[PDB]
Design a protein around this ligand. Sequence first.
Ligand SMILES: OC[C@H]1O[C@@H](O[C@H]2[C@H](O)[C@@H](O)[C@H](O)O[C@@H]2CO)[C@H](O)[C@@H](O)[C@H]1O
Ligand SMILES: OC[C@H]1O[C@@H](O[C@H]2[C@H](O)[C@@H](O)[C@H](O)O[C@@H]2CO)[C@H](O)[C@@H](O)[C@H]1O
Lengths: 133, 133
Amino acid sequence: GGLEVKNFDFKVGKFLTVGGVINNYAKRFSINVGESTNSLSLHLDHRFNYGADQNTIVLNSMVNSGWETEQRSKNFPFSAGEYFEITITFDTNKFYIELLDGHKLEFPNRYKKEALNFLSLAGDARLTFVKLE
Amino acid sequence: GGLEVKNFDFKVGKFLTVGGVINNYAKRFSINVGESTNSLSLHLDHRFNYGADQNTIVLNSMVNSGWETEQRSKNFPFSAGEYFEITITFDTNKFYIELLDGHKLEFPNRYKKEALNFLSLAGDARLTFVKLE
Ligand SMILES: OC[C@H]1O[C@@H](O[C@H]2[C@H](O)[C@@H](O)[C@H](O)O[C@@H]2CO)[C@H](O)[C@@H](O)[C@H]1O
Ligand SMILES: OC[C@H]1O[C@@H](O[C@H]2[C@H](O)[C@@H](O)[C@H](O)O[C@@H]2CO)[C@H](O)[C@@H](O)[C@H]1O
């Protein structure tokens, strides 16, 4: 399942923008890009309240076997019940992430991916649109 | 290479908005919705100039690898070089297509499908925007 959009070649130099609305109540929501649900180059988890993580972004990658080493950021422009928008692009070394308030993040391209074929949102939000150009 | 958007389940009751840019000097561009590249419930070919078709939308479906019987529309709010946007819904009997105009088309849901999992664009355009609500 999940819509296969043929034209969307999310490769080095392309910019992926996702937009949506965070649930009225929210602990966290994530943007995930990689090969599949369990094989991710970038997991971008925006945690309003998840364990010791309050208004913290957690970044990580995943392999079938499990999660890798987390990175954290306190840049947190999001609020429950509000519009979110995120743009992601990458080269062979890094992912470059821009949040709607102009905050910017970076994350290693650990598996040296040149193209990504899978996107999801998970957690307490809904995905409205996917833009690629 | 394509992007699977996990969250997007294009089933009866949902509204698929597809957007992009038409190439300068365009001759035709098409939007396709189905199960796979050669199995389509809806093919919308927006023909600026293709054979005897001038500023005409050609609507069809594809079963096995074969085109079925074409329907045509002369409502053509499209310009080379410009952004386009089209919204598609369906129930088990019809597909409903709304143009940026407000102009609407209807096409039979020939194979009475309840969900579609493949979207593509071909010809003198690029697909940049996919929204689903
Ligand atoms: O690494 C992303 C991954 O984190 C999991 O939660 C971690 C948490 O980040 C960490 O602080 C704690 O020590 O271990 C938890 C369990 O592994 C999430 O459960 C998972 O959904 C991802 O978000
Ligand atoms: O039916 C969609 C399909 O049409 C093809 O062109 C047709 C044309 O529309 C028809 O009037 C003529 O009789 O036969 C042509 C060949 O089947 C396009 O070539 C194809 O790309 C689709 O758009």
